[PDB]
Amino acid sequence: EYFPSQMLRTGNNFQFTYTFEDVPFHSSYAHSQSLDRLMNPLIDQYLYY
Amino acid sequence: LKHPPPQILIKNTPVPADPPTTFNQSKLNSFITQYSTGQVSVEIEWELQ
First to last CA, chain A: 71
CA B36 to chain centre: 9
- Method of determination? cryo-EM
Between A and B, how many CB-CB pairs are < 8 A? 4
CA angle A38, A41, A43 (to 5 degrees): 110
Q: Say if CB B15 and CB B34 are below 8 A apart.
A: yes
By C-alpha distance, the chain A residue nearest B26 is: A46
B25's CB contacts (< 8 A; 6+ apart) are A44, A46
Resolution of the experimentally solved model in angstroms: 2.4
Closest CA to B34 of B14, B48, B20: B14
- How far is it, in rounded angstroms, from Cα A5 to Cα A16? 13
Closest CA to B10 of B36, B32, B30, B28: B36
For residue B13, what is the DSSP state? P
